[PDB]
Ligand binder design. Structure first.
Ligand SMILES: *Cc1c(COP(=O)(O)O)cnc(C)c1O
Ligand SMILES: *Cc1c(COP(=O)(O)O)cnc(C)c1O
Ligand SMILES: *Cc1c(COP(=O)(O)O)cnc(C)c1O
Ligand SMILES: *Cc1c(COP(=O)(O)O)cnc(C)c1O
Ligand code: NA
Ligand code: NA
Ligand code: NA
Ligand code: NA
Ligand code: NA
Ligand code: NA
Ligand code: NA
Ligand code: NA
Lengths: 380, 380, 380, 380
């Protein structure tokens, strides 16, 4: 019914056989057949299907109001499976600032296979309409994006994609199914790095894909069985487990995000703050129209590299590590950690200043996180 | 020193920190950094590297006398990573009868990306030399093959590939590193479905790749990090564990294989038997030159479909399931289970008769397995 | 600092070696020694200590403001370890209505070893003072208790125990360290069935013990190493993981508990309601003095057995199963499931009527849980 | 049929529901009930029973030709459960040189509960008959024992126990069910530290108990459910897995043991060698009558402490660690590691000289292990 209930009771996450209230971990590769071709419960080889992976697929299908779910060994494995729906000569439109691993896969792997790619600022959807070529097959958007949290209108992207015969894809990692459901907005395929909020405990690398489209689902299933980037049963189980607390975690994170943003906007050592909840943020109205909460990723500007490093060292509760969506609050400097390969002046032009800090808000106490960052900002 | 010792002490499979005599299971996704860019032990994100996966990679590199190892979420994920070394327009030569999942990936996925593929009978290596096009980049061989155990000369394939500038790849699943080491024979890349003998307990779906080539290793690492078909830590641990008993298991299996083949050749209800140990087998001398033992996969002909099904039902210790390399002995009918999509007359032409039976010998008692199959054959 | 922060950053739950932000799972039994007796990090045999178990012990010590932690294979293993601090002829005072497994262990196992036991209504602490014999060594209390949630004054029990030289023990399962810390109130030893709220996901059977007493800790360590009821590394890891969300879960549960109690008190098909938050509840003031929140266990009276069974069948979000502290809301009938062995008239005398229902509130949406139970109560 | 077959197909280690050829890992604590008291498959709470633990219990019952199996969190947890069959005032006869953890539990824990214990040299069974008191309830023997491998006649111990109404128990760790089956010889209860050979990979701490006695089984079940020293599902699964290779491992170990003993007896730096295969060993005939193979534990005398330490440092394939039954060969000095608490002169009197070395033979190559130890012995 309501979301926190659906998180607990949605999907199949009990054992029909023994009644176990948690999904059994089928650490197995093959299955007995009573007669050639007669499978007791549909299973014959774990690559093709595994009952624990099936459980987590069922969960992500349910939570995104889709019909079919797919678990891959990582977010980029999910993304590659989706891109492999295309053929050489086909063309993809993506938002200009996609995740660096997505960019790296597309421009360094799939263009070698004849996939054509254009990166486009989708904060104006007419920019998509201009980018459409006769060969364009796919529209792939993240919203909001990293690390500047640019918002793209999901419903209009869906309409554009429908009118031009495009497979529409949304990378919904930053919002999770708890706050944003692209399938409800006409999108064909939604995916996630479950490594982030869904697993939620920094202990699983996984990707999840959902669709309501039977034919796209058949093609994704064939790709996943042929290229084999499948999530194992232990990790599927840990995903199912971590998703149970997703609503509580996201809501704690959102409370903290509101307070932290008030603090950041007030503080003199902080310049621009990037987050879709700020009403002056580009496409704020759009985000509130397609989502009923916020991501825990915030970026803000301190003065320079040394200010940023001092910030990191002076916090007690912000941890320096890769990834986002942990229980811990994480802190990073994109210009040094994710965009250090881009030349400095291009970084500056794009907004990736040396003092740009990205925090991923965790589930620590709101007051502690506000106070800790402030006292660290006070030391500049 | 000797192989059973190297299986126990080869690779890094203890914890340097605590002294744990088994590899810790790093069920983790990210790692603390003491300063931006300073990684305590080289780890920063589990997709890129994970210490348990690193352990199993170290093992497969050691066992194949390579320098670099790679663990993927399945055998076909390893194969796809290797194929993604190529670009559109490049061409691959494979043995005509490759594993059906390899064939399916190549002809249904990678040709859509402009990879050109020719399937060629490599039991005569000059057939490779004829198939070489100006665009040919890769030579990929299984030996022995499924389900008829056709043998390909690995060292000559390596020489051909060297002389023509081809990346040479051997799928070494059926023999394991215990009996056959393609890298020692000049091959550039060796891979395995670790789902089969290496894991050895029917409880892990995994692939493993080894190379001594620094530049090929860099490209494989980049592909694996960008497309993300990585083996998880729990499965890496179970692989490391199962590999410990590989020598003992393979040797039990080989003893059983010798006895079972004597029985099969003697029995009147059995016609042709396919296995490289039979001296009349094509390229028997070649196999004995490149290997010092045998695969546990045998195929043999009974009269028809009903004979085969009666065989399956009458055995007590042969289990009907997919996969091979279990502790259990497995039995299957290719014509119904792996080649049922091919038209019947093509099946017949290729040797896949309705009565062709494939067994994968397990580690049960030799006498029990010989006697059980015989009494089942006696009921025809 | 504040509790939700301490839950994330309290204890040692990262890897010092690799920087892994989660505790590695040391699925290992023994450890290399560089020289006889020189242990790299203190480990020599997993029964005696295991680094994953050490992590969870560190967590429970931190969360209870103790100094030493101990993980056992179940709550009753923890309880038995504590009771084995005593010698034959020694005497224990417990609250009259202890958990049935505690009662069963004490009266059916440990009295056969000469441990003397008296069950006493500790809601009046002077009742403890009367029960003190010259042989009395231990005072063991649960608060609040099952299934009627009787409250015992922890601080006065601590004072009594100090003055009479008793080892004081509190079973703190129902409240968790998040709401009640008996060690801060003078108690010598606190324990938990971590099977319930701490693990919190119905997927671990475990016990946890904490103390600040060095000498009691030495004796508990010796007992645990000699009788061997140790929690394994995988379960220790899952405990550490589940404890991260304990504050969020308990707080969601508490919000639901307040609303559900308002509903129950209003409903005509419900008679008495048992929960320490009700101001007419015996020792309500005491509970609010020793705790800053509430357990999720509520009991209430419907009319009879058939009413109770109809309730169970008519709910959509209350699940019929054993245990408490799940993410799911659980429902049970003590008179049939936990006290069916007691004669009916004794049941009635004790308050365990046929229509006594026990719910353990989960983390589903508050409104859904209130509405679901009401509409089920409406069908009576 | 034959033992290696029974190891693979004995017990229930597949999933009836999905056909999974390996036991699912029920990482769960509780089970749904369709109606109050109606359990779908007999499960209601994992402490009481868990389907993965049930699988391993089934295996150990099968392998010991018993009827009931029990998995505990460690060998000493199994031993304590068995001892808790007794009441205060009851008396136990054990062999004089029992495992130090058994001795420590009995004399430091259970005597505090009024259990009386006598340690007796059972290599002459009439020594048991003399030790029998009117209060004697249990006869507990290890054979062969640690570290001097003293052999006790199991069948005569069974007869004595029957005639005097004693519960007879054999700790069968060192021999495993593969070579010695005390239940077939009249013994009431057999147990194991599965930490050693059965798990076989140094990655599980576990105990296993088997019996054919329905009433003893009821009492063991009640004890295990009340005191709660249960083996978790992940460890139960790893036990089931490791037991598959037990025959192959034990047989490799036995081949190595024969060769290593020839070498040791020949070498001039080695004095006495203790192992039941040596024909001059006390009760050699008895051992060959009750077993059809050998333990992998050997002890032998070098000259002194410095010789022993030089031996340890000079080997390449003998690892210094606690425990036995690994895949690795392990080496230890009892006088320093397991008997360092006993005064020196008592050590000497008992045979625990400073130069007494204990090796546990692993599954490395036989020649490597013989040669490695010899060249290390050559450096003295
Ligand atoms: C309430 C509920 C739903 C409803 O899903 P919506 O499409 O969001 O209304 C789905 N699944 C479960 C298990 C529920 O309890
Ligand atoms: C003996 C030994 C080797 C030797 O490897 P080969 O190339 O086959 O000679 C390698 N690693 C370990 C651990 C060994 O013990
Ligand atoms: C704040 C904090 C504490 C403080 O504990 P209290 O005794 O409750 O004040 C302890 N540990 C950590 C990690 C903390 O962050
Ligand atoms: C052969 C066989 C047995 C026979 O057991 P024994 O008592 O040793 O003869 C038992 N179980 C299985 C599965 C077997 O295959
Ligand atoms: Na459900
Ligand atoms: Na649609
Ligand atoms: Na090693
Ligand atoms: Na080479
Ligand atoms: Na910490
Ligand atoms: Na105190
Ligand atoms: Na079986
Ligand atoms: Na008997």
């Amino acid at each position: 019914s309501n979301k926190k209930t659906k998180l607990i009771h949605g999907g199949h996450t009990t054992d029909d056989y023994t009644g176990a209230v948690t999904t059994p971990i089928y650490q197995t590769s093959t299955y007995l057949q009573d007669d050639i071709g007669d499978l007791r419960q549909g299973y014959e080889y774990s690559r093709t299907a595994n009952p624990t992976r099936s459980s987590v697929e069922s969960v992500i299908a349910t939570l995104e109001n889709g019909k079919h779910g797919f678990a891959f060994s990582s977010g980029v494995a999910a993304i590659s499976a989706v891109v492999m729906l295309l053929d050489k000569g086909d063309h993809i439109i993506l938002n200009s600032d996609v995740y660096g691993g997505t960019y790296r896969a597309l421009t360094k792997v799939f263009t070698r296979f004849g996939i054509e790619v254009d990166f486009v600022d989708t904060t104006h959807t007419d920019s998509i309409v201009q980018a459409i070529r006769p060969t364009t097959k796919m529209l792939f958007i993240e919203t909001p994006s990293n690390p500047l949290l640019r918002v793209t209108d999901i419903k209009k992207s869906a309409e554009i994609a429908k009118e031009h015969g495009l497979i529409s894809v949304v990378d919904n990692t930053f919002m999770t199914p708890y706050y944003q459901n692209p399938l409800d907005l006409g999108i064909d395929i939604v995916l996630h790095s479950a490594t982030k909020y869904l697993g939620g405990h920094s202990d699983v690398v996984a990707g999840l894909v959902a669709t309501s489209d039977d034919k796209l689902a058949e093609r994704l299933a064939f790709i996943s069985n042929s290229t084999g980037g499948i999530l194992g049963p232990q990790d599927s189980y840990l995903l199912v487990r971590g998703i149970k607390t997703l609503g509580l975690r996201m809501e704690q994170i959102n409370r903290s995000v509101i307070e932290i943003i008030k603090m950041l906007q007030a503080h003199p050592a902080v310049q621009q703050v990037f987050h879709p909840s700020i009403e002056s943020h580009l496409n704020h109205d759009v985000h509130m129209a397609q989502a009923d909460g916020h991501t825990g990723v915030i970026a803000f500007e301190v003065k320079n590299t040394e200010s940023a490093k001092q910030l990191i060292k002076a916090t007690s509760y912000y941890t320096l590590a890769e990834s986002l969506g942990a229980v811990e609050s994480l802190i990073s400097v994109p210009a040094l950690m994710t965009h250090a390969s881009i030349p400095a002046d291009i970084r500056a032009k794009e907004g990736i200043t040396d003092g740009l800090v990205r925090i991923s808000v965790g589930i620590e106490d709101t007051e502690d996180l506000v106070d800790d960052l402030k006292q660290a900002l006070d030391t500049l």
